[PDB]
Amino acid sequence: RIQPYHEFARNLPVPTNLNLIHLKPLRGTGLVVFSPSLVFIAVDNLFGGDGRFPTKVEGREFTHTEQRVINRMLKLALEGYSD
Amino acid sequence: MSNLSGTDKSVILLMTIGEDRAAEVFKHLSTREVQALSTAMANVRQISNKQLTDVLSEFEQEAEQFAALNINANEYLRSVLVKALGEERASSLLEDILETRDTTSGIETLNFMEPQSAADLIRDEHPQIIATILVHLKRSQAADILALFDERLRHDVMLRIATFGGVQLAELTEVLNGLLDGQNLKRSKMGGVRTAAEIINLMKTQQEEAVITAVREFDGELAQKIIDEMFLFENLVDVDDRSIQRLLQEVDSESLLIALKGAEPPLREKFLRNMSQRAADILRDDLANRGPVRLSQVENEQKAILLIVRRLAETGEMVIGSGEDTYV
Amino acid sequence: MSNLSGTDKSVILLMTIGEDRAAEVFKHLSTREVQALSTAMANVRQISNKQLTDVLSEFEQEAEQFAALNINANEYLRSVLVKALGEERASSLLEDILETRDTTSGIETLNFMEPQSAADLIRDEHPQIIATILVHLKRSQAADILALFDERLRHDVMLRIATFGGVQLAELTEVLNGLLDGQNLKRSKMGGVRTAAEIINLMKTQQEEAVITAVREFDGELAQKIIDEMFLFENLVDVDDRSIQRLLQEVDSESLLIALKGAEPPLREKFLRNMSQRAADILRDDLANRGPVRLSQVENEQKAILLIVRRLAETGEMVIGSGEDTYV
Amino acid sequence: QLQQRRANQRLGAEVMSQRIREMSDNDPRVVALVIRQWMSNDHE
Amino acid sequence: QLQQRRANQRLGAEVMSQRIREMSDNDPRVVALVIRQWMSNDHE
């Protein structure tokens, strides 16, 4: 998709997780965004569950364990991006 | 010859063995043990000659039973296993053993303290990790933790258990480590509900009444919670009769007589039926004969009675568990 | 003089013989034995002088009965047989012996543990390999495993047996090795049905009832399974009379009297017919005379009775095997 | 007499410091376990 | 007297370490079987 930043931000479902990347030698930043749905599915599968009981997002900030799982999948995504 | 604790004796040995000596001692000691040790010497009392002689003689008699010529277990095992089974096998199995010990230590440590602390520690966590941590704890402690969550969260957690599909060990040991680090927060909660109720109880009558009116104006529900936690002095009207008799087995007659002058007539009527018949008749006669008493003295006697009730409840004899609950 | 286990004595010997010495000791030891050894020293207690003296004296008295001047069996046999029968014959026969021992050890090991574990281990496998592995195991263990599969899978497996036509040994030893590696998974099942039922049992009445209602709303069948596993306290109405008398031979009279205040009248009527006539009359008189009791105390007594039932069932005296089954 | 008593007490303390230092050089894990056992005895 | 008792105990421990080391150099499989038998005795 090719769109203005304001349109992309409006289309982005708030709340969600965002992460910045620096890509040498190009000056700038990448804006990888992970959704509550995928972090939910990842944590559910890692900690043991079937996903038949989804929970809504109530604006609560992600737990430290959730951030750690996010980092775990984030480094894998970045390595796949690089290779 | 002041009695010397194990902390004192350990400090006596540690500041005498040496610098790198104490450091290598802590290399085979847990972090919290190093904490307890470091807390000691910077405020310890200076040692006596016979005190150090006695503690080091105790160290000698313990060293008689403790003589091994041992080498560091982790590095010794690594050096043996790297050639016994290979570097990769040695590393993998050492990490497996370390993770197993980490999760066992976490489970044991978590099944040791008061429930509500761990309950509030895990309240913010994701319900799935809550469920798995809950079930791998001791069943009694698990029940204690579960009896404190809200309806929706507790129901979701048990649904997760009823639909459980298995949990990995390595990430779970990591979760135990993370919640251990979360426990390692230098924070003092000091709930402003129980402490507030106790402070208002220790207040005088006029002060506590004006304070209660102010909190009822600001937020009546908080006032109701505070009074339901503190009960004041008049709660003896809703106190059970057996507990009143248990209290009367210790309260003093003249103090009770002085306090009852300012008490409500219904409270006096309920109270006089609890003690013995001759004691009740004596108390009624004393109330009739005795003239007016200072309200300050009456308040002091009532506060003393309240303090007696509080300590006898701390001992567990008294049952003030939020009223007279339900009769069955 | 703490009692020292074989693990402790072995560790004492191993960390004293040497590094390559311990490695060459493990070269003649099984992998799980090396695991049990490695689990020990990294959390062992440092040994005593007299402790090491005693364990090494025991090692000396065992070495008196153990002295042969032996050489490594596998390489000694290979070196002898390469010239006795030739390289190819020696290699082939050594591999034949090794495979025979592998399959025998696998069969023996598999005929040792609880059935459902191996049942779920082999559930995902292909039914033909299931059939051959099932029959080559012990008949009792084979029956235990077979009584746990589903209708279609079990029927297909037995049809495979009835139409069986011989099985190769080498691939079967390889299959035993593969399922041994599958057993070597650092995995904790955490059954969320039995543990959930026990947790809800340890709940208080209001909590467990709200939890049961929530799980019935989410999925009623899971609620039914949990309650059929846990039975709560009211299941004494469906507990057999002989078991009730066996309980009454141990339960305490005042605890039973307090608990029966909150019990259902039909449950009380069933329960009072089990004990002796004079005991039942005494209990009825005590129930009539005693006034209302706190529901918290009644719940505590009921939970204590439930715990007594649970331990007496763990001992095997109790028969609570999912109801009163079928009368014949 | 008190001075000599203190002097011999100090000399004995120094020599037992020598022996404890050499024993802990042989094995500091013994000292770690002694400290852990003292901690265990502290809480009762 | 306690010091001499510990000293002779240590010397005996060292010489018995010498003999166990030489015997296990002669045959380490003996040590392996002793450990296996100790493991067998552990579980009852």
Short mmCIF file of C-alpha atoms in Angstrom, two decimals, chain A residues 40 43-50 52-53 55 60 63-66 68 72, chain B residues 124-126 128-129 132 156 159-160 163-168 171 174-175 178:
data_model
loop_
_atom_site.label_atom_id
_atom_site.label_comp_id
_atom_site.label_asym_id
_atom_site.label_seq_id
_atom_site.Cartn_x
_atom_site.Cartn_y
_atom_site.Cartn_z
CA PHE A 40 -2.38 -12.17 22.01
CA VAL A 43 1.36 -15.34 24.06
CA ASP A 44 -1.62 -17.72 24.12
CA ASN A 45 0.23 -20.34 22.06
CA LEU A 46 3.46 -19.90 24.03
CA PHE A 47 1.80 -20.15 27.46
CA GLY A 48 -0.75 -22.80 26.48
CA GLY A 49 -4.22 -22.21 25.09
CA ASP A 50 -6.64 -22.79 22.25
CA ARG A 52 -11.43 -20.03 21.75
CA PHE A 53 -11.72 -17.39 24.51
CA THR A 55 -10.28 -11.04 25.29
CA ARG A 60 -4.23 -1.35 29.38
CA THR A 63 2.66 -6.39 30.54
CA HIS A 64 6.41 -6.87 30.84
CA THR A 65 6.04 -10.51 29.80
CA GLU A 66 4.06 -9.40 26.75
CA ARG A 68 9.40 -9.63 26.23
CA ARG A 72 11.36 -12.26 20.99
CA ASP B 124 -1.89 -6.92 36.17
CA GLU B 125 -0.51 -9.99 34.37
CA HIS B 126 -2.13 -11.62 31.36
CA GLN B 128 -3.12 -17.04 30.68
CA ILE B 129 0.19 -16.61 32.50
CA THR B 132 -0.39 -21.36 34.50
CA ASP B 156 -11.48 -16.31 32.59
CA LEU B 159 -11.80 -21.27 31.81
CA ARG B 160 -8.18 -21.17 30.67
CA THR B 163 -9.33 -25.55 28.36
CA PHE B 164 -5.63 -25.88 29.14
CA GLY B 165 -3.47 -27.33 26.39
CA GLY B 166 -0.05 -27.43 27.99
CA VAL B 167 2.72 -24.98 28.83
CA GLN B 168 6.42 -24.89 27.94
CA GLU B 171 9.64 -19.73 29.05
CA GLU B 174 11.87 -17.24 32.57
CA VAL B 175 8.45 -16.04 33.77
CA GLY B 178 10.69 -12.14 35.78
#
